[PDB]
Design a protein around this ligand. Structure first.
Ligand SMILES: *C(=C)[C@@H]1/C(=C/C2=NC(=C\c3[nH]c(/C=C4\NC(=O)C(C=C)=C4C)c(C)c3CCC(=O)O)/C(CCC(=O)O)=C2C)NC(=O)[C@@H]1C
Length: 147
């Protein structure tokens, strides 16, 4: 079968349950580095962002180049982090307190992001959790090719 959608759904569920976080989702980039939240596991208590189309200026202007070379975002508390206003308001609209966002690659090509959000309260991200989510993104990268 190699059903990609099923594997991705299982992945984000697996991650959300194991890290005990409020949302894990996959953001898939369009050809211009806009994109869509294509798969999501979220706690019922918060609003689902599934299939939201996002036109993020940082991604669209850089064309993901930094994320293609392994940059990631790990922020425990988005209100004390130094974020520009419009990006903080996107996160606020997604009800985010803390964010761990890692690149999903096809070779060196940035295909999307694998993102964990904490929505209840801030949350320190541990070293291993960053490695965990990155390694999950590796597994997704393999699956995408062969889907
Ligand atoms: C203003 C014009 C807005 C805008 C600008 C910026 N976005 C920025 C960085 C950025 N954007 C993302 C995107 C997501 N985070 C998610 O959780 C999801 C979906 C589930 C998406 C699509 C991330 C991860 C980052 C961090 C990049 C990084 O620095 O590692 C920035 C730069 C950050 C800053 O200076 O605060 C700007 C500016 N994005 C908007 O949507 C509107 C258009």
């Amino acid at each position: 079968m190699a059903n990609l959608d099923k594997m991705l759904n299982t992945t984000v569920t697996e991650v959300r349950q194991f890290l005990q976080v409020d949302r894990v989702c996959v953001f898939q980039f369009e050809e211009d580095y806009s994109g869509v939240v294509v798969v999501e596991a979220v706690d019922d208590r918060w609003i689902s962002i599934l299939k939201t189309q996002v036109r993020d200026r940082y991604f669209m202007e850089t064309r993901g180049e930094e994320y293609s070379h392994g940059r990631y975002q790990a922020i425990a508390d988005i209100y004390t982090a130094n974020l520009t206003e419009c990006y903080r308001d996107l996160l606020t609209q997604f009800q985010v307190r803390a964010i761990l966002a890692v690149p999903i690659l096809q070779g060196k090509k940035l295909w999307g992001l694998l993102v964990a959000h904490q929505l209840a309260a801030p949350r320190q991200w541990q070293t291993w959790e960053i490695d965990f989510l990155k390694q999950q993104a590796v597994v997704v990268g393999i699956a995408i090719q062969q889907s």
